[PDB]
Design a binder for this molecule. Structure first.
Ligand SMILES: CCCCCCCC/C=C\CCCCCCCC(=O)O[C@@H](COC(=O)CCCCCCCCCCCCCCC)COP(=O)([O-])OCC[N+](C)(C)C
Ligand SMILES: CCCCCCCC/C=C\CCCCCCCC(=O)O[C@@H](COC(=O)CCCCCCCCCCCCCCC)COP(=O)([O-])OCC[N+](C)(C)C
Ligand SMILES: CC(=O)N[C@H]1[C@@H](OP(=O)(O)OP(=O)(O)OC[C@H]2O[C@@H](n3ccc(=O)[nH]c3=O)[C@H](O)[C@@H]2O)O[C@H](CO)[C@@H](O)[C@@H]1O
Ligand SMILES: CC(=O)N[C@H]1[C@@H](OP(=O)(O)OP(=O)(O)OC[C@H]2O[C@@H](n3ccc(=O)[nH]c3=O)[C@H](O)[C@@H]2O)O[C@H](CO)[C@@H](O)[C@@H]1O
Ligand SMILES: [Mg+2]
Ligand SMILES: [Mg+2]
Lengths: 700, 700
């Protein structure tokens, strides 16, 4: 048909039996896509939405990218989607959604790898009627087929998902859903799945909004509709929602101390950072979040530089052009906001949420955060370096000024996060030596012991992150996290104990610690109260404080030590039937003997590797230059403050031209500066959250 | 023939033409070896030496192992061998060698990899008549052939090797040579080549002595005979010779400062360490050296534990059993010396030498020394741990005592080499702070600058050795070596300057530096004079002193950071002739549709990796535990001596229960202890060399 392989094989008699309990419900269509994603329209490839008597104008296209997820995660995502669609078809007073909105929504499941996909998921997919085995082809007319497209409109919905089963039923209350199962055949990464979603089927369907989901992310009963409502404002070019950690049956997972930490971290992030950024107009949407992008807004330059990167490039490598892939989705946001002659803004929707599952062991936690930290660091660097693009866009003067201010503040936060390695050690060492030097009881030996414990855990973390893999050594990482938590406890004890003794004595530089610690805690709590989600402030808060030194001295170290994933990397056969082989006049020729010799004589008379190894060498050099600069700059700060690195020796020698004192006023000055910075950051984020809630309330 | 593939195809008419200028000169025999090395005799595989009317009893078997060497290196080795054979056939007053000794010597060339071999070498090999293309088979009777054996007795010899050609002639003065070209087909390592040499063809030939050569190692005009003469003493179970760096045409390569360093290092090693060990009776033969092993001595337990390792082992891993492969050839020596009920000794022959080619760039130099350092470290650890085996052997009481003493002294040297990382820094820092503290002029800033330069070059060396590869970053390694050489120059200047000023003033702890530095230099020079090879003592000596800090702070770091090489790591096709394909009743069946669905339904109802990854994880853990212990122990020494690591702070706090002084007497005590150790080592090696020369002279 039209030069492409197609097939319409009716679904199983069983499925068709319940579906009946029109043509598109009754056949399942297959399509062998053998072209590039950016050639779907010109190759005469189409989708059923475009074949009926009246073509279907789609309003919302939902992309689910699955790699090897079990049927539970995918079933969770699909159940969320079907619940949303049922809500949107039961809506009464609405111009867009209605009893036939099931026709304006398309679900696109871009599976990755025919080898990698879990059959557990294909069981669910075929049970829904969007897939069946037998007619998947491996190459068509000397061309390898790039992916397989199965299209069905199933009338069944998942209504219950226990810990082991998914309940599929077909009643008068179920709604049809337009599935579209894409299935790549070889393991190309997530960016290629997005390339198929955006440059491929979105070019044929022409949706209004394009929503990106993952496998295992459950949207709420009402989340997708609330995210769709954000695009009423014609200036909105993107949006995102809140991300909740799901705690399992009656919050059983809170007993794990690595899940409570992430619960508090997620809810703090959503309450403070997302609202503060959304006030200005530019967001940097969280990885696990589900986002939506107006097709017109992302169409053109944003997509082009998200997929291919900076085109202007010679045969050699350039820094931003060849590393931008580390900040994958955060380039779409930056290019949408700063589009030329266009005033798109990014908005954060709090009425839309989705509950995802978080890692529960340290190895996978570290491996997950390795991508987040690198992405956030490179995205901030790039966005700060290219802030002049804000003044070439179409925004008004006030919105350009606001975006410039936000880009400066984001780089300020990145600069703070870069020096955390030295900041934590400086605070810890100054505090432990100050209390020892003031009270003398047993804190001298504790100071020495804790200095040595940190150094044995920092050195080992560097070495294992540079050479080993987290899965190989999990017990050591658990031990390191426990040791850092104990050090945190000791730091808290020192601060409280000296503050209490100074209160009894009344010093300023230590009673100030009480002043700030209370201010930032109260700002956190007041923001939580205003956001109307305050239970995290006590339920899962302590574990965040204890596993916070391990987020600054383990996740950061592994993230920086693993910037890029560097993977370095006949004739003749005899089978005699029975003591007898094949004879001939070949070789017997003597002239050939003088001819299979003269050639060899001449070869004793006559007297850079591929692009992959070159790119790998460049990536390794970049990774080892970043690490070295990080360590050197942090030690520069430490040696300037504590007078380590032989500086105190040098000053003593100049004075002789004496001996080293125990502590100086630089320690006090630095100790005040750090808490001032922390207080300023907390104040800024509190003000941002307050403005967000006030504006939202007035608009509502 | 006998169930194995054979072929006797006369050599090229050209070759045969000059050979004539008997049967074995005229045919070249091929053999497809499809068994294991330890099965050659039982498989009814033989070699021509065993087929004549009178079987040939071989006296000397020479093994040359080549991997991808050009025809120049292999031609060099072959020319050395043919010169030796000519010398041994022209000998007059000898019971063994004579006009027919060409019959008692077999050359075995165990090439590795049909894919890896350089055709440049096959040109030379076929030009000699020991190889010709066309009848090499890839598998025989459903069995893959393991290697190809070509056997010829060529009458041509190489008589001149210019920089670009090898001169092959056939006169009345040439001698026949019994070549035997082994050619493995897949890249198995050198230990498997030795397994073929020892468990394979040596089992058929039954030689008296087995000599191991490499491609590119040129034995002298008389070296092999002088090595053979060492086995007259029935107690000798092995032997080795001197290794000379060849300097090229009129010593042009001495202009390179990385070749002069290795020249001096090699000649010092041969003069001191080999003679000192050979006095006791156990040697640990240098890597590039060519060695000989009596077959009876190595036959049995030594070979068995060289090839397979410790047999007693459960499913899990053990340290020595699973890492002994790092000390490859040094296990043969240890097992020969300590053989049960046998009194074999290892002797060092100085009358036999061989000139090899040394690396001239820093990346390949580091990569070469990475194997030497790991091998020497593990071999010393194993030999010290198993010294009790010396008292279970057959030696007399005095020789057991001598071997025990030697094993203790070797581990003492290893223990010294383990702490060199801290020793160098301690000496450097104490010296630079002492001169600054005494003279004040400009040495304060130099002390700070040099402390920072060392730390920026040590940190970078750790990071690049752990993450990167030497070939990727050569400029930085050159820069680091230059910086370390400048630091060495500054240390020498400080020592000389303070010693001169103390001489003018007359302190003891610095004029002592002059006392030792002169004693060790004079012992070096006197040993060189006695060994009668004194030109290295001035020609290539300075470059060894300047590139010595880079042998302690670059080769060691890379060797320890790279202990083991950790490499982590369908149906359907359509080709329509013309808009028409293959149709059938397959799939059309509806029952199958309900059958390709019920299976999937059930798969949604039903509700450690391989040995390689486990071994890789174990190896990585071992590598990262060794590194951590090395760094921790060296810093323990440094912090105890210099009172770093917060110890001085702790002592000051106890005294308050004051402030840190600049330097203590621990620095003086350590500084004296180090030079005392150096003087003791130099004295021991000088005495060993003197005893060696005196004994050899008296015996001669
Ligand atoms: C240590 C024990 C374990 C050793 C383990 C193994 C050996 C490793 C080298 C240890 C060298 C210690 C030297 C020393 O005295 O430390 C000093 C600095 O302390 C630090 O800043 C070091 C922190 C630990 C780094 C460990 C290496 C990890 C890689 C790199 C990771 C990033 C490193 C940078 C992070 C910001 C101690 O400072 P102080 O004396 O308290 O200051 C007052 C000085 N005064 C009295 C003159 C006023
Ligand atoms: C540094 C600049 C570059 C930083 C680069 C980058 C940051 C790395 C951490 C630097 C921490 C320095 C802390 C410091 O003051 O150093 C101290 C120790 O000095 C050493 O022993 C450190 C030697 C360099 C190690 C660099 C790390 C490489 C990995 C590990 C390699 C193996 C490490 C162990 C090798 C034996 C200085 O000692 P001192 O003050 O002169 O002693 C007298 C003290 N007193 C006055 C109280 C009496
Ligand atoms: C290197 C690594 O171990 N990554 C970890 C991390 O990354 P992280 O969670 O960032 O990444 P995910 O693998 O979860 O990727 C998110 C989306 O990508 C799809 N998709 C598609 C193609 C592809 O190559 N990769 C891919 O992930 C995924 O199923 C999902 O749809 O998350 C999890 C920890 O809880 C673990 O699964 C992993 O240990
Ligand atoms: C990892 C590495 O880079 N090794 C380096 C080093 O090791 P090094 O010199 O120790 O090792 P060699 O490769 O020279 O090995 C010696 C003998 O082994 C044969 N043989 C056989 C099989 C096999 O797998 N390997 C093998 O080496 C060799 O040709 C030779 O006959 O020496 C040289 C530096 O000047 C370089 O060639 C290499 O950069
Ligand atoms: Mg997931
Ligand atoms: Mg070689």
């Amino acid at each position: 048909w039209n030069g492409n392989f197609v097939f319409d094989s009716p679904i199983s008699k069983t499925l068709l039996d319940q579906y009946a309990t029109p043509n598109e419900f009754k056949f399942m269509r297959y399509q062998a896509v053998t072209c590039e994603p950016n050639q779907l329209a010109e190759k005469n490839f189409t989708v059923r939405q475009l074949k009926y008597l009246t073509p279907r104008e789609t309003e919302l296209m939902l992309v689910v990218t699955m790699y090897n997820e079990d049927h539970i995660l995918l079933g969770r995502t699909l159940k969320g989607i079907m619940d949303n669609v049922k809500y949107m078809v039961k809506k009464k007073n609405s111009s867009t959604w209605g009893p036939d909105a099931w026709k304006k929504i398309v679900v696109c499941i871009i599976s990755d790898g025919r080898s990698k996909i879990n059959e557990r998921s294909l069981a669910l997919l075929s049970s829904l009627g969007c897939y069946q085995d037998g007619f998947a082809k491996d190459e068509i007319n000397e061309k390898k087929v790039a992916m397989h497209v199965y299209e069905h409109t199933t009338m069944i919905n998942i209504t219950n998902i226990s810990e082991s089963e998914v309940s599929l039923e077909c009643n008068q209350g179920t709604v049809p859903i337009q599935l579209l199962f894409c299935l790549k055949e070889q393991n190309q990464k997530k960016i290629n799945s997005h390339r198929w979603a955006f440059e491929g089927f979105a070019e044929l369907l022409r949706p209004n909004i394009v929503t990106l989901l993952d496998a295992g992310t459950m949207p709420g009963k009402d989340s997708i509709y609330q995210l769709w409502r954000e695009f009423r404002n014609p200036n909105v070019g993107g949006a995102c929602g809140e991300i909740r950690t799901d705690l399992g049956k009656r919050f059983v997972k809170l007993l794990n101390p690595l899940v409570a930490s992430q619960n508090f971290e997620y809810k703090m992030s959503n309450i403070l950072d997302k609202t503060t950024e959304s006030n200005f107009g530019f967001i940097t949407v969280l990885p696990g979040a589900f986002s939506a992008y107006r097709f017109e807004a992302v169409r053109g330059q944003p997509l082009q530089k998200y997929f291919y990167g900076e085109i202007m490039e010679n045969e050699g490598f350039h820094f931003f052009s060849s590393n931008m892939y580390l900040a994958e989705d955060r380039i779409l946001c930056f290019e949408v906001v700063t589009k030329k002659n266009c005033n798109w803004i990014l908005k954060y929707c709090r009425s839309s949420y989705a509950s995802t599952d978080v890692p529960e062991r340290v190895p996978e936690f570290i491996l997950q955060r390795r991508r987040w930290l690198n992405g956030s660091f490179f995205a901030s660097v790039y966005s700060f370096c290219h802030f002049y693009r804000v003044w070439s866009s179409g925004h008004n003067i006030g919105r350009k000024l606001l975006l410039t201010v936000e880009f400066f503040y984001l780089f300020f936060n990145t600069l703070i996060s870069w020096f955390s390695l030295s900041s934590f050690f400086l605070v810890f060492r100054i505090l432990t030596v100050s209390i020892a030097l003031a009270y003398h009881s047993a804190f001298n030996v504790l100071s020495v012991i804790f200095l040595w414990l940190y150094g044995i855990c920092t050195l080992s973390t560097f070495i294992l992150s540079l050479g080993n893999k987290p899965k190989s050594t999990e017990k050591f990482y658990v031990l390191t996290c426990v040791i850092f938590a104990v050090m945190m406890i000791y730091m808290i004890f020192c601060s409280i104990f000296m503050s209490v003794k100074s209160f009894q004595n009344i010093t300023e530089a230590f009673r100030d610690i009480v002043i700030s610690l209370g201010s930032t805690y109260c700002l956190y709590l007041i923001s939580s109260i205003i956001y109307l989600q305050p239970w995290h402030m006590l339920t899962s808060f302590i574990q965040y404080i204890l596993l916070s030194p391990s987020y600054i001295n383990v996740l950061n170290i592994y993230a920086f030590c693993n910037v890029h994933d560097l993977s370095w990397g006949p004739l003749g056969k005899i089978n005699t039937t029975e003591d007898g082989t094949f004879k001939m006049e070949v070789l017997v020729s003597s002239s050939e003997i003088q001819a299979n010799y003269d050639k060899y004589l001449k070869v004793l008379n006559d007297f850079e590797p591929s692009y992959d190894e070159k790119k790998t060498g460049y990536y390794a050099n970049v990774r080892s230059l970043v690490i070295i600069f990080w360590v050197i700059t942090n030690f520069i700060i430490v040696a300037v403050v504590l007078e380590t690195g032989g500086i105190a020796d040098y000053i003593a020698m100049k004075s002789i031209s004496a001996e080293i004192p125990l502590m100086t006023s630089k320690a006090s000055i630095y100790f005040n500066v750090i808490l001032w910075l922390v207080a300023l950051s907390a104040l800024i984020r509190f003000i941002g959250c307050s403005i967000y809630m006030i504006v939202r309330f007035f608009k509502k």
